Symmetry: C3
Subunit: 458 residues, 3 copies
């Protein structure tokens, strides 16, 4: 009797799970929204520099209109190798945000110290790996909360808390190839192993070296650490990057997971549109909404407010096929990256609508309980849209100078709705709905043309 080889089965549930972390794939939580959960772990925030400039350059005529295709190939080639190192070292990629990602090693507290050593080693192997593009890495460790929010058809998650805020601080202060440890990371870690320098005006710290003691054996140390990693592929599945590669069809799980993924993506997953259709350099409008709270680490207070905000944002965006691309925590606050003009979703009057939608969101969210300040940046132009990451873990994302600009506007011009010149000039609206603003110098943007506040009709 023959025993023929099982072919890899590439079921839709497996393709959907590529878009999600293990935290969600194997999470099985309740129905209620907001849902919150609490744990400890180590975070790695890996940021690549030089890609939005490449994006700008790949719009140039030398790429003969294969700009999007060439950009995504070279981006995925580099990012895939980072993703693979993270997975092999036992991390869960939580989210891609443009050309950056955030990864988690969830463990019990007693194991944090040993796991911090695993993540440092991983970081230094990634730095190793590095077209003129650098990588900055922040690491943090401690308490983390997860929030899941949404409605009957859509779900979103976020991590929140002091380690989350720390990991962004640590990354922001890194020079152009540094691994920086949060102060808490630095004090929980195994100091006899790691050689650091102080850094100016902060107790956060820079890693120079991993100097293991005499007969420390990393492979034995790692194996010990795997005892505490729930989903590390092993045994018969040790040749796989992710256990989620082995998920089997299960309608109830697939219904829960698909809510996290955008419809146009699901369509490609179902072999109902060409795989190449979602990689594009297209003109869109970014509406970047920032919500700040009294205490942004306190998930039981902020969770309800984010749910409330999401219910309203989703309904006004729907009126324009606008879409939420991603949600995440910034140093200040919860940010919704919203996009008008995603593929097949091109209403004309995009700019006008982007502005009215932004005002509506600003007015509603301002009155939501616990939301201290709302800030919204609106910028318009040619951005890269596409699937970024590795075949086994990847997400739909947007990269471009205009995405960066909208993000910086909401930070540098808090408490108001701001817009760029393309949006101002291109909108239908009367000029006195706007106020021209003082020019501010902003991190990693040059030649923002004039900026405007969208005042509305006083």
């Amino acid at each position: 009797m023959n025993t023929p080889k099982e072919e890899f089965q590439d079921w839709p549930i497996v393709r959907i799970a590529a878009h999600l972390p293990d935290l969600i794939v194997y999470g099985h939580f309740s129905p209620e929204r907001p849902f919150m959960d609490y744990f400890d772990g180590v975070l790695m925030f890996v940021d690549i520099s030089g890609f939005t400039a490449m994006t700008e350059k790949f719009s140039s005529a030398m790429y003969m209109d294969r700009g999007a295709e060439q950009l995504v190939e070279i981006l995925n080639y580099h990012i895939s190798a980072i993703v693979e190192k993270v997975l092999i070292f036992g991390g869960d990629i939580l989210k891609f945000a443009g050309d950056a990602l955030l990864a988690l090693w969830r463990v019990e507290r007693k194991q944090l110290k040993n796991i911090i050593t695993v993540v440092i080693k991983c970081s230094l192997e990634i730095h190793g790996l590095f077209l003129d593009i650098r990588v900055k890495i922040g690491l943090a460790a401690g308490h983390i909360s997860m929030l899941v929010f949404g409605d009957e058809t859509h779900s979103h998650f976020l991590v929140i808390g002091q380690a989350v805020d720390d990991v962004r601080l640590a990354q922001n202060m890194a020079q152009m190839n540094d691994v920086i440890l949060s102060p808490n990371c630095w004090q929980l870690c195994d100091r006899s192993m790691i050689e650091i320098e102080s850094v100016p005006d902060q107790r956060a710290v820079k890693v120079n070296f991993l100097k293991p003691p005499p007969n420390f054996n990393f492979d034995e140390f790692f194996t010990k650490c795997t005892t505490f990693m729930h989903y590390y592929p092993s045994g018969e599945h040790k040749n796989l990057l992710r256990l989620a590669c082995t998920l089997k069809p299960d309608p109830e799980l697939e219904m829960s997971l698909q809510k996290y993924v955008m419809e146009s993506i699901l369509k490609q997953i179902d072999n109902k549109q060409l795989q190449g259709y979602l990689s594009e350099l297209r003109p869109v409008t970014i509406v970047f909404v920032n919500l700040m709270f009294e205490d942004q680490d306190k998930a039981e207070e902020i969770g309800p407010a984010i749910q409330d905000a999401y219910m309203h944002i989703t309904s006004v965006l729907k009126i324009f096929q606008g879409q939420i691309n991603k949600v995440f925590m910034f140093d200040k606050g919860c940010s919704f990256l919203c996009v008008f003009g995603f593929p097949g979703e091109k209403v004309p009057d995009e700019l006008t609508h982007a502005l009215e939608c932004a005002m509506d969101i600003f007015d509603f969210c301002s009155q939501v309980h616990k939301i201290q300040t709302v800030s919204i940046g609106v910028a318009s132009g040619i951005v890269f849209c596409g699937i970024v990451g590795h075949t086994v873990r990847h997400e739909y994302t947007v990269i471009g100078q205009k995405v960066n600009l909208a993000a910086r506007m909401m930070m540098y011009y808090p408490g108001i709705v701001t817009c760029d010149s393309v949006t101002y000039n291109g909108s239908n609206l009367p000029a006195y709905f706007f106020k021209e603003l003082p020019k501010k110098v902003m991190k990693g943007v040059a030649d923002s043309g004039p900026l405007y506040q969208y005042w509305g009709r006083t």
Copy 2:
């Protein structure tokens, strides 16, 4: 000199042969239609229950319009494993009929007894395998005839005869996890091996156990049996499920095989339409035509009559892009499962045309020599349409409560054209073309709304 690995070549002839059994792939028969051939073998008729109810439920809004996609994934996941067991045990899957299949082990008579033991073991391993869904299995053994019929562009085949009628009886009388043997099966089999119970009002029989004698070794027994299996993958190809995976391009064979497969399928095979396009929950009209004969086991009489009927049915269906989905033998008669509204084939006035086409078929076929009774059931609604089975053996099929309803109407209301309420209400036709019928209780249907006879214009 390098010896690089041959890549699996997935030629169109290989993809076409996935849709056909070995009986046809390696058959090489004459041109004439009808063609008949005679042999012996064992049949297994495996029926899954619970799928048309799942079909109904997957139309619900909780599946967020990925109903068809989720249904086909979970159906193929389970059905694939059954297909694989059948192939590994050396069977030929002849046909899929909704959520049921029919499999054949063709052998010389002297070998029937030993082969019956192989098929029982296979059946019990399939029962093993079993969302709330059961499997019933009928087995039969003895004489089988095959009929091939059609025209210059289309071919169809059917198995006919006493073992065929038996295998349906045996399956129909099974409780909700039984393996039932036909009476002839029971008397040809190796009684010292198999432990049965009698069943009420029949000499057909239920298998409880396979109790091999002391040093019976199944693997050695199976290998002996493979001597009599012409196409069992072996040698260099022993890691394959089917020898048809190794077919090489051959224009003459491919022209003969493609006649059995629907054009829209061929289009996907040729990479001229998206693979996902044929999995759908769509509104269609089922026209189920049943032909009964004096003697339905006598292939030399009935073959000409089925050919004649097919020539006419095909021409009237063509006038409406109606399509024959499948043909097979029921307990009484030869059934054509015809469908109006298959993809890209959506004439409006579908219902009216379904009725006129049915009357035309009824009038012509009634006068064909040797056809004793014609019965036709017409039902309309949302049915699943798609490719069911395993990657190496699969077929386009329709599953749904309306498919079941049309099948039961033609059996419970013999000799007339019947239709459901959707068809009656939705058609263009005047009310006095119909007669409202007495309500009958019918196997595995509830809430058939009112039923009508299509009388035509007296």
Copy 3:
């Protein structure tokens, strides 16, 4: 720590390189056009017979409109095996021209003799391999020049010189399974190894046998020869057909390589159109342009003239979406195979435009310095268009009786623009723009209907 298997990555740069030889993939030459380079090597020109007749026959109704699909499958099945033998024996496939290909073994002069023995052995293994279709093979050895020409968006290359002219002569004089060696090939080769016959009225020669001396061991001899093959897959990559299978994304290289490949092909490479869309039997018009020179082996003279011609041809074709399918050297001259009606590029008035474009090209090119004679054949009808070759090395090509006819017209009616009856009858133009020509018997065409010269408006 796991070491999971790297998946084959099928990056766009790798798919583009399938369309090109190593001579271009690993060439890295300057920007300037024309670019010329000089080397030595052995050429093999493998011609299949019987395919354009199969093409004709696959338009017949017996193929049920899957003619193109069946033709390409059976063509690629046979051609793939030839390609594979050529690659395994260390050759570079330079170009496909319908159902023929040209392959190169580039080496230093001292190694030519040993390499000639490798190529003969390869030839005899290919002859081995051979629906009623024969293979003729010409071999030549010596000096070869390569010309690269084009503009900012498109590149083309050609090999030129005495070995190139020789390899076509040798192939043209072969009977219907011969391997013929050019005279220069015959005198550089290892005469103690190869058993030949003379052939009528030529010092070119026919191979009967390879009779290696007593303890000649071909595998050891081949390995020695691999020392001189720059890109022979080896080591970790010895299970690959081509080293180009390992190319990694690199925007600068990909921009240079994509210029050689047609846009519609790039679109399929980018997963923006169905793979099956480019295999078709479609009506097109072939415009075959032949340029002759005083000395066609002298690349420093002819290179500028071909560049000049190309700049003009490309601009007039653009005005009609006409396309250059391929360029190559014929026994006399440089030929541009141009096509009107490639997919998505179907202007009506195709025939008229094909004629005016041809006249324009004829008038301009006639005055280009160093171009002695221009000849252009225009023929219209159903031709096969599609990707021919092996998965790792393949090209878009056209095959058909009309392609052959246009090629023969430009040779048998030199110095003028000629057209077939379909073109004459179907064009819009007044009858006195044409002159009906004397009927000539032409190699491998029968029933060319009447032929005409396109005179233009005197």
